[PDB]
Amino acid sequence: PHQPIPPSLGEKDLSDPFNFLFSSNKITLRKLYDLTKNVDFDQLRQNECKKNITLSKFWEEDDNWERFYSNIGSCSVYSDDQMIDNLLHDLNTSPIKHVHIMDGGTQVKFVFTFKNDKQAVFKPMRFGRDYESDPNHFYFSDFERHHAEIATFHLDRVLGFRRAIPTVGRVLNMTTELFEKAEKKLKKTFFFSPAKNFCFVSRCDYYCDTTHAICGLPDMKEGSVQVFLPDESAVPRKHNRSPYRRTYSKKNQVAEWQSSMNYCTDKVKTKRQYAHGRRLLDLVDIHILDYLIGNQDRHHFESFNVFNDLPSYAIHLDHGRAFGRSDFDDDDIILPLRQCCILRPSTFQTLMNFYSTPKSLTKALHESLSKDPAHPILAYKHYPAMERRLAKIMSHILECFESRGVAEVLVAEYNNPDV
């Protein structure tokens, strides 16, 4: 079957997820050690965030949604892992009151309204964990992977960013939790395949059709469950076009930043929004995240616009098109690091230590993913891929230093002398 059962309901893979060969380059490691061993990282980390305050203290707790919303910080989506794990557990277990077709993106997704009237975003499982994207597919043709959303949230935490949105795996009874709880116009898009599996078409721009319907085996269906963002009226948001947006066309397949190595110097460092602040440092952080997971679909950034007079940060969202290929690294994604050559000091240290201990990043990710009820979240073949991609990032960091000085790269805030 193209759409298999949730792996958690299948035979348990007992194989060693780390019986693969990886040995980090020691030359690169030591060279990255000398130019930074005397840098006062402690002083730097304290400048990466101007003012660290939450929404509750700014606006001057019945459930885990409300405590999450209140604890949304000005330099982070969340701190305190234990309450998020409580929110995750709640997202997995809370009874569903309503299911509605979600208004927004292009691929199939529902908004869950729980009994307590709180909400979440649902993205249905389609293919298995082992599935790799068609090599002929562009970034805009890939069907989203629910398990990538889960995997990235955990990885975003492991990297200490905590700017992704809490997401948990969940296996639904399509009859009781989806169909019977679905709005009428969604309800009518349900049907049975010739194999007597339960299926729904839903309605959306991207292949919500009979041919590409989501189907259970026969009646269960795993999906990613992501806590809804706080209301737009209460916590408004900004939608910003990325300067490293891809072309999204098959004819002209090469954007300027893909062909021009001076793109960062000439086209973004000189822009109003990026010349001063944290935005560019955010962009480097997110493309490091996108490169590790192979996410090519970063066309826009989403940010809260609620902490007045404080710099906003990009919310690490939309990771459905990540983890599509385990045997391919898209060096184009990490281009902003190579072109801009600035890097948040905490990120460097965080990136460090992980590299200095081979397999530690992927090990630190796996146990984190394991606590998700839908584990295994990622096929193990993606683990060596992430270690390799990490190594390239380190090499690319080394390149940034000698060309554009080491004291010019590691900054807690970015300022362009010419704006």
Ligand X SMILES: *[C@@H]1O[C@H](CO)[C@@H](O[C@@H]2O[C@H](CO)[C@@H](O)[C@H](O)[C@H]2NC(C)=O)[C@H](O)[C@H]1NC(C)=O
Ligand Y SMILES: *[C@@H]1O[C@H](CO)[C@@H](O[C@@H]2O[C@H](CO)[C@@H](O[C@H]3O[C@H](CO)[C@@H](O)[C@H](O)[C@@H]3O)[C@H](O)[C@H]2NC(C)=O)[C@H](O)[C@H]1NC(C)=O
Known binding-site positions: 107, 123, 144, 226-229, 302, 318
Nearest-angstrom CA–CA distance, 323 and 147: 9
Nearest-angstrom CA–CA distance, 372 and 57: 31
Binding mask 309-328 for ligand ADP (x = CB under 6 A): --------xx-x--------
Q: Does 105 help bind ligand ADP (rule: CB under 6 A)? A: yes
Q: Which stretch binds ligand X (CB under 6 A): 118-126, 168-176, 206-214, 298-306?
A: 168-176
Q: Does 42 help bind ligand Y (rule: CB under 6 A)? A: no
- Mark out the alpha helices in 20-112 (DSSP H runs): 26-34, 41-45, 55-58, 64-70, 81-93
Nearest-angstrom CA–CA distance, 409 and 419: 18
Geometric angle at alpha carbon 269, from 328 and 309, rounded to 5°: 110
Q: Which residues are catalytic?
A: 297
Binding mask 163-202 for ligand ADP (x = CB under 6 A): --x-------------------------------------
What's the closest the beta carbon of residue 310 comes to ligand X, in angstroms? 46
Nearer Cβ to ligand X (106/176): 176
Nearest to 168 by CA among 121, 225, 118, 223: 225
Binding mask 77-106 for ligand Y (x = CB under 6 A): --xx-x------------------------
Q: Does 142 help bind Mn ion (rule: CB under 5 A)? A: no
- Tell me the residue type at 21: L
What's the closest the beta carbon of residue 135 comes to ligand X, in angstroms? 35
**For 54, which DSSP code?**
B
Beta-sheet pairing, 96-101 with 110-114: antiparallel
Name the 3-class secondary structure at 316: strand
Nearer Cβ to ligand ADP (165/397): 165
Cβ(148)–Cβ(322) below 8 Å: yes
Give the interface with Mn ion as residue ranges (CB under 5 A). Answer: 105, 318, 320-321
Give the interface with ligand Y as residue ranges (CB under 6 A). Answer: 49, 52, 73, 75-76, 79-80, 82
